[PDB]
Amino acid sequence: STGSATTTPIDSLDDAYITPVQIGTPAQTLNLDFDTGSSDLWVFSSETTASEVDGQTIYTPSKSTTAKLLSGATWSISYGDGSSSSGDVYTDTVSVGGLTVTGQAVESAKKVSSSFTEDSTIDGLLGLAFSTLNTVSPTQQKTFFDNAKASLDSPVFTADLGYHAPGTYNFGFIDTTAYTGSITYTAVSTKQGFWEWTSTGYAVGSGTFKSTSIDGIADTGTTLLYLPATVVSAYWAQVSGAKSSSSVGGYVFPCSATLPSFTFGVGSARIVIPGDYIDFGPISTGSSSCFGGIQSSAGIGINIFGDVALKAAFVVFNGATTPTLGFASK
Ligand SMILES: CCn1ccc(CN)c1
């Protein structure tokens, strides 16, 4: 089997991407944030505290003839931005782009933090990291991809995120029309539960490529590119007036600037992020200070190849017995 679904930016900045997902019988379609940095499929629901729902579409398990309470199971997750959610668990039929999994754990939110409430466009998350990170207790649950994998034509999914435009998540096949050149594959460590890999270096604009190993994760659920402070300083030093602002929480730059590109290495191959992809717009409405899309990972503990980086590539998440990542230009 295969599946193919369009993923759409939630706003004009590509702050996140939503993909429609069918849950239950009859189908209830929710728009979920596909997140290769986490491993829980959770949804706003009829159980979510009413004051914490503000415009989201909810899953109502009592209206699904295939929903079953997973008795005793609870979940609770916290994310890198400090947001969080928790609740109980149903199993139900979940379909993405024509690919159907029966018995998928659908984690029903009883509580969500304010940042989720405030984002009316995201009805929940669909985790695509390794199932070892799934938070369901006392019986850990598998991701949608892990459950689908044996049925898939090939044990892979691909992310093709657009810049200010829709893109595609495919399951079970590699669309050879969706990228240019060849796909360069690189090793993955699953030791931390992430699609963790080592970039071979970087370049800023037209500058010379610096060969240096950068360990990080391919994370569709993180907006920006978070890299070591040395690398990020080298980038922003090429932008007149750019500075790190403690009050804003990262590098900002004059909105009048033209940003240089940023290149990252995948083995001997190179992915070029155009400068425009690094502009996240005014820090507040009407400001002439703009927020940068490349930020320091120093306070995180891990480097994150988030959407800013991934949207410049066609990305293969290869879930074979030994997982690997593939990157192609597009
Ligand atoms: C934009 C919604 N969101 C918040 C945290 C995550 C996971 N990185 C997704």
Author numbering: 1 to 330
What do the study authors state?
The performance of this subset was validated in two fragment screening campaigns using the model system endothiapepsin (EP) and the NS2B–NS3 protease complex of the Zika virus. EP is an aspartic protease with the catalytic dyad formed by Asp35 and Asp219 and has served as a model protein for finding inhibitors for other aspartic proteases like β-secretase, a key target for treating Alzheimer's disease. As a second and real-life target, we addressed the NS2B–NS3 Zika protease which is crucial for the viral life cycle of the Zika virus but with its shallow active site challenging to target.
In our fragment screen against the ESFL-96 selection we identified 30 binding fragments, with a total of 42 binding events. The fragments are well distributed over the entire peptide recognition cleft. All but three binding events are within the peptide recognition cleft. Eleven of the fragments interact via H-bonds with the catalytic dyad and additional eleven hits form H-bonds with the catalytic water, interacting indirectly with the catalytic dyad. In short, 20 μl of soaking solution containing 19.8% (w/v) PEG-4000, 68 mM ammonium acetate, 19.3% (v/v) glycerol and 9% (v/v) DMSO were added to the fragment plate. Fragments were resolubilized in the soaking solution and for each fragment one crystal was incubated overnight. The fragment hits were modelled by inspection of the respective dataset in COOT.
